Ligand binder design. Sequence first.
Ligand SMILES: O=[N+]([O-])c1cc(N[C@H]2CCN(Cc3ccc(OC(F)(F)F)cc3)C2)ccc1CO
Ligand SMILES: Nc1ncnc2c1ncn2[C@@H]1O[C@H](COP(=O)(O)O)[C@@H](OP(=O)(O)O)[C@H]1O
Length: 259
Amino acid sequence: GAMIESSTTIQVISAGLPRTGTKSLKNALEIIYHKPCYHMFEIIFNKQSDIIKWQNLIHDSHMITTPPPLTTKTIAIYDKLKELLDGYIATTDLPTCGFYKDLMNIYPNAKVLLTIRDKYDWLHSLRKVVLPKSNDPWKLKIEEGDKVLGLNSDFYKLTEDSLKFAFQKDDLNFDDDQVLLECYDEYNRLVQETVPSDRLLVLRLGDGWEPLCKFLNVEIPNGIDYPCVNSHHQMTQLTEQLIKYKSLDAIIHMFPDLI
Ligand SMILES: O=[N+]([O-])c1cc(N[C@H]2CCN(Cc3ccc(OC(F)(F)F)cc3)C2)ccc1CO
Ligand SMILES: Nc1ncnc2c1ncn2[C@@H]1O[C@H](COP(=O)(O)O)[C@@H](OP(=O)(O)O)[C@H]1O
């Protein structure tokens, strides 16, 4: 196809939850658009200063009144969300995904994705990477590796609070598998009930380039396979290597596309 000059603004809002292919989608969107896509890894690697800003935004998010129409308090909140996302062409992952309805208002010409997968595979992946149970010894290795990156309790607070916001819960028993599974199913159901189908594409792990590129009116990137990154096995290796070498920069060349 012809090359066209794309606008550097949010063009794709992905409502999918963590551990549903968000990093592969981030990479895929950057391959298509040649500009950055937001993801938790963007916070970790480039924008740790944004942690407190997302936390403040979630703390105030209860004061959003669902437009239309648009109130003054909502506008203040929307301006800070637009500020956080300046320079990016898409959103994925926590902390953004729970804001999908508000992002649709701010970027009315953006299209919406939902990444989904088997609920038990999701929970297993989540327990291995994001939210190990309190008495799981792996949780201590996770925390040891994360300190190497400069991640502290405020990082974990943002994950917890952005998950609570996505699930619209005032509190959450993070160690309760039944609660998390029900929240996952209800969240994915609600996205599909809220977003007009003309503006939504539901992606399953393995769908690849074709449905995504058709939805976005772009050619399939030639000779580039659809990304497959961020498996829990890979994350386990990264945590262990962070622990062993005590720096990211010592090991970064061993994780090329993930990072
Ligand atoms: O949904 N979350 O908020 C969310 C939380 C976490 N959690 C923490 C706790 C386990 N810890 C291990 C870890 C993981 C990735 C790393 O990757 C890199 F350094 F960025 F490359 C380094 C260390 C990271 C991970 C991903 C996400 C969402 O994508
Ligand atoms: N192209 C692909 N095909 C199949 N699975 C994929 C994939 N890209 C990512 N995944 C899976 O998506 C999960 C990561 O999602 P996220 O990037 O949102 O954290 C991982 O699941 P597992 O942990 O079950 O391996 C990873 O293996």
